[PDB]
Amino acid sequence: PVEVMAENARTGSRQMQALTPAQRASAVNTLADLLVSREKFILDANAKDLAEAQKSGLAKPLLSRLSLNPAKLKNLSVGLKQIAEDSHKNVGRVLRRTRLADQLELKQVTVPIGVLLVIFESRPDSLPQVAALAMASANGLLLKGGKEAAHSNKALMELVKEALATVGAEHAVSLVSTREEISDLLSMENHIDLIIPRGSSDLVRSIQQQSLHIPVLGHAEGVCHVYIDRDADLEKALRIARDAKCDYPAACNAMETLLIHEDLMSGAIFGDVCNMLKREGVKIYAGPRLNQQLTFGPPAAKSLKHEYGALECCIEVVPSLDEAINHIHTYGSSHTDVIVTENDAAARQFLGSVDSACVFHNASSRFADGFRFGLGAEVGISTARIHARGPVGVEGLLTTKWILEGQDHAAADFAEGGGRTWLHETLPLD
Amino acid sequence: PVEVMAENARTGSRQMQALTPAQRASAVNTLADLLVSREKFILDANAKDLAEAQKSGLAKPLLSRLSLNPAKLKNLSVGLKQIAEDSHKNVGRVLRRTRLADQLELKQVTVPIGVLLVIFESRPDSLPQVAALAMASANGLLLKGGKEAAHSNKALMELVKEALATVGAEHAVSLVSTREEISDLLSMENHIDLIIPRGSSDLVRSIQQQSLHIPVLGHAEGVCHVYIDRDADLEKALRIARDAKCDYPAACNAMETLLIHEDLMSGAIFGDVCNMLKREGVKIYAGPRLNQQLTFGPPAAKSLKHEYGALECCIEVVPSLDEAINHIHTYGSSHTDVIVTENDAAARQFLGSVDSACVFHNASSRFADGFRFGLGAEVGISTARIHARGPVGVEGLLTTKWILEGQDHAAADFAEGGGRTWLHETLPLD
Numbered sequence: 001p002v003e004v005m006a007e008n009a010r011t012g013s014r015q016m017q018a019l020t021p022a023q024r025a026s027a028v029n030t031l032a033d034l035l036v037s038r039e040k041f042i043l044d045a046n047a048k049d050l051a052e053a054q055k056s057g058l059a060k061p062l063l064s065r066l067s068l069n070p071a072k073l074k075n076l077s078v079g080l081k082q083i084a085e086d087s088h089k090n091v092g093r094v095l096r097r098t099r100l101a102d103q104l105e106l107k108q109v110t111v112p113i114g115v116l117l118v119i120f121e122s123r124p125d126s127l128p129q130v131a132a133l134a135m136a137s138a139n140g141l142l143l144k145g146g147k148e149a150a151h152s153n154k155a156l157m158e159l160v161k162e163a164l165a166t167v168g169a170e171h172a173v174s175l176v177s178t179r180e181e182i183s184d185l186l187s188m189e190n191h192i193d194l195i196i197p198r199g200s201s202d203l204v205r206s207i208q209q210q211s212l213h214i215p216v217l218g219h220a221e222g223v224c225h226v227y228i229d230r231d232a233d234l235e236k237a238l239r240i241a242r243d244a245k246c247d248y249p250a251a252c253n254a255m256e257t258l259l260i261h262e263d264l265m266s267g268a269i270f271g272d273v274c275n276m277l278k279r280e281g282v283k284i285y286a287g288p289r290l291n292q293q294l295t296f297g298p299p300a301a302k303s304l305k306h307e308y309g310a311l312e313c314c315i316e317v318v319p320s321l322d323e324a325i326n327h328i329h330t331y332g333s334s335h336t337d338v339i340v341t342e343n344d345a346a347a348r349q350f351l352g353s354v355d356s357a358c359v360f361h362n363a364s365s366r367f368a369d370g371f372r373f374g375l376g377a378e379v380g381i382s383t384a385r386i387h388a389r390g391p392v393g394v395e396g397l398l399t400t401k402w403i404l405e406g407q408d409h410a411a412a413d414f415a416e417g418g419g420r421t422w423l424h425e426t427l428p429l430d
Numbered sequence: 431p432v433e434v435m436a437e438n439a440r441t442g443s444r445q446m447q448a449l450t451p452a453q454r455a456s457a458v459n460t461l462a463d464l465l466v467s468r469e470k471f472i473l474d475a476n477a478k479d480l481a482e483a484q485k486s487g488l489a490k491p492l493l494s495r496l497s498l499n500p501a502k503l504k505n506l507s508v509g510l511k512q513i514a515e516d517s518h519k520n521v522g523r524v525l526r527r528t529r530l531a532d533q534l535e536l537k538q539v540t541v542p543i544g545v546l547l548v549i550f551e552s553r554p555d556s557l558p559q560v561a562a563l564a565m566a567s568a569n570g571l572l573l574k575g576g577k578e579a580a581h582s583n584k585a586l587m588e589l590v591k592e593a594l595a596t597v598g599a600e601h602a603v604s605l606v607s608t609r610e611e612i613s614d615l616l617s618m619e620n621h622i623d624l625i626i627p628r629g630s631s632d633l634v635r636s637i638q639q640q641s642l643h644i645p646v647l648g649h650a651e652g653v654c655h656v657y658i659d660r661d662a663d664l665e666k667a668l669r670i671a672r673d674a675k676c677d678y679p680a681a682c683n684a685m686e687t688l689l690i691h692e693d694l695m696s697g698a699i700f701g702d703v704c705n706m707l708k709r710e711g712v713k714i715y716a717g718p719r720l721n722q723q724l725t726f727g728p729p730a731a732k733s734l735k736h737e738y739g740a741l742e743c744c745i746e747v748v749p750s751l752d753e754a755i756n757h758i759h760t761y762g763s764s765h766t767d768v769i770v771t772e773n774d775a776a777a778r779q780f781l782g783s784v785d786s787a788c789v790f791h792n793a794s795s796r797f798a799d800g801f802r803f804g805l806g807a808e809v810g811i812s813t814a815r816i817h818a819r820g821p822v823g824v825e826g827l828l829t830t831k832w833i834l835e836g837q838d839h840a841a842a843d844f845a846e847g848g849g850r851t852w853l854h855e856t857l858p859l860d
Contacts, residue, residue, distance in 0.1 A: 358833070362835070401787065
């Protein structure tokens with residue numbers, strides 16, 4: 001059934017909550033041991049199901065991404081061992097240590113969240129990553145893939161459950177049957193806490209439209225932005241755009257626009273960047289002011305807020321940096337923005353003005369990866385303005401909790417009748 | 431109109447964003463100056479509108495709470511001066527300072543949120559508190575009261591706007607007309623960020639039912655919980671219940687239940703606590719196991735999860751602390767819970783097991799006030815499991831933002847083609 005799974009996972013969260021010191025670590029490292037040692041089962045199941053699914057041949061992305069190879073197994077094993085070694089103090093870290101009065105220490109500490117929900121398309125590689133993260137956050141977790149990889153999902157479920165049953169002896173992890181009318185599973189509440197979609201923009205937007213009365217992680221668009229000032233070296237901007245677009249076009253934090261200072265139009269940079277885009281085969285449109293600017297220029301852009309994903313990039317030019325901030329806050333998804341120049345006045349002004357989830361200077365839009373952030377294995381990219389900004393490591397998965405151990409105190413005692421005063425001496429948090 | 435207000439407030443947030451060092455502080459202290467110096471206007475308006483509203487005589491709570499006195503003015507003035515003095519470094523505080531490679535410093539800093547929305551019943555005292563908080567968070571803020579206090583709302587709006595126009599010269603603050611079909615104002619999005627209801631449980635629950643596709647602060651019930659172990663002094667528990675219930679019955683974080691160890695039933699404590707409840711006139715019900723326990727006992731409780739607010743408290747007894755944790759997580763709103771005993775094994779076990787927003791030991795349920803937390807002037811009580819837990823000071827009103835100022839770097843440079851390595855030397859955050 002379903003609800004039984006929810007409450008079983010709740011209790012398992014309660015259980016795993018009491019296994020912090022190297023215990024869950026032993027669990028996940030043993031999981032990595034089995035993931036690297038008993039692989040036969042796994043790839044034979046995958047070969048079976050993939051042979052079954054190729055005849056379907058739904059679409060290039062899935063049909064290409066769902067496969068698996070021993071190289072991927074080794075990669076996952078080493079990443080999981082890294083998570084295990086570095087994730088030893090996720091839960092229980094202190095945040096405030098204040099003594100209000102004699103022998104009274106209020107403190108706020110981190111806490112597991114509870115029954116998470118992970119949603120993703122065919123990605124048999126994904127499940128172990130997220131599961132290791134959950135086990136590193138000791139919190140419950142639910143799982144739901146799609147129509148495909150079914151047998152492999154089962155196999156990995158069995159493997160991780162076996163690795164689990166060793167320590168803790170209580171399983172707070174599951175998987176569900178065919179698509180289980182996910183609108184239902186979402187309508188559930190008081191059990192599940194945060195939604196983590198992982199399939200792709202289509203799927204996350206499906207969630208966004210469905211998502212109601214339940215908090216949501218993740219983003220919906222990846223509309224980055226790049227501006228050039230009149231005070232930047234040409235080839236710098238050139239290689240910047242080159243790397244920022246022609247690295248992973250389908251990626252979410254890849255630049256899909258370009259703005260330029262008006263004055264640099266007379267320095268023939270424009271043609272140079274278009275030459276680069278052609279060398280990388282980029283279908284570029286034009287922007288209204290630029291549209292006017294040249295005799296014909298590139299063709300006309302449909303809408304400024306479009307999302308391409310392929311080798312396309314809108315281009316537009318504006319007189320003042322202020323106009324640039326206007327256009328950004330107007331059209332940008334506040335996902336990830338940048339600026340290039342060699343005067344810092346523009347830099348300070350821009351970076352204090354723009355309000356994206358993460359901004360840059362002389363860098364690429366292709367840095368939002370969590371790992372590149374030295375933030376370990378990320379789980380999503382929050383565009384929401386709450387609890388998390390952009391790349392979410394493990395931190396956005398453990399909330400806070402106040403505790404307080406009074407000796408004999410009460411509330412009215414601090415009134416004038418009782419001799420109680422207030423100290424607020426925030427001791428050095430351990 | 432409305433949207434013009436939204437965007438004007440956005441721009442004003444941009445503006446006030448550039449006034450951190452003692453500038454907004456000067457603004458709010460001058461606001462306090464005028465709030466304490468030009469009071470004539472204010473109380474005459476209030477007298478007018480209150481005389482008009484008494485003939486209506488809607489209900490005791492509002493008709494009693496909406497008034498105002500020079501004492502309240504002095505109190506607000508001093509609280510605002512406190513906020514001004516201690517809130518000098520809200521925005522711009524660093525959180526991570528990591529250098530990924532040579533001359534490349536990624537850093538994550540705090541940031542204003544944007545267009546807040548405050549909703550509350552007749553509380554002419556409230557508006558200046560929240561407005562000072564906003565000005566202390568430099569972020570936009572919207573305002574909406576109710577049918578009453580209209581002229582006083584206007585007057586205070588004018589006063590705070592005059593105090594504003596001095597510094598910043600840009601007003602990001604407003605108020606709306608009669609109730610403006612708040613469902614509409616809520617349906618707005620991409621402008622407003624967080625909802626802060628302030629009226630009362632009825633109103634916040636109205637929001638909760640309405641609240642969709644927009645994050646929400648606040649709580650919905652205040653179902654606290656108190657347990658007694660077989661290892662606690664009697665009169666300790668007695669005075670605890672006394673203070674925890676008979677201090678502010680209508681308060682939200684006031685205890686509205688009671689659990690007891692089974693063995694203490696033979697120590698006649700039960701009658702003692704009932705004597706206390708009678709001395710304080712508390713209509714008590716009974717719990718199913720207790721219901722069975724005595725020959726007749728107190729009468730039968732309708733439902734365990736009821737909310738009283740008045741001088742009532744359910745009472746129930748269970749054999750094992752584990753049963754207690756079960757009942758808590760089953761019925762408790764995870765709002766605020768406690769335990770009393772004199773063995774610490776029970777203490778550690780309980781406090782690691784229970785998962786409320788804030789827990790206690792030998793203290794009262796009447797501590798959730800933010801101010802008592804030495805957390806300054808709180809704004810609400812978050813029961814949600816995201817971004818904030820229980821009492822929210824100013825901290826839950828400033829989110830994070832990554833910035834990064836590279837020199838000439840790029841993304842592929844860190845691949846094997848370019849000689850780039852990773853340092854992750856988290857410098858001491860300033």
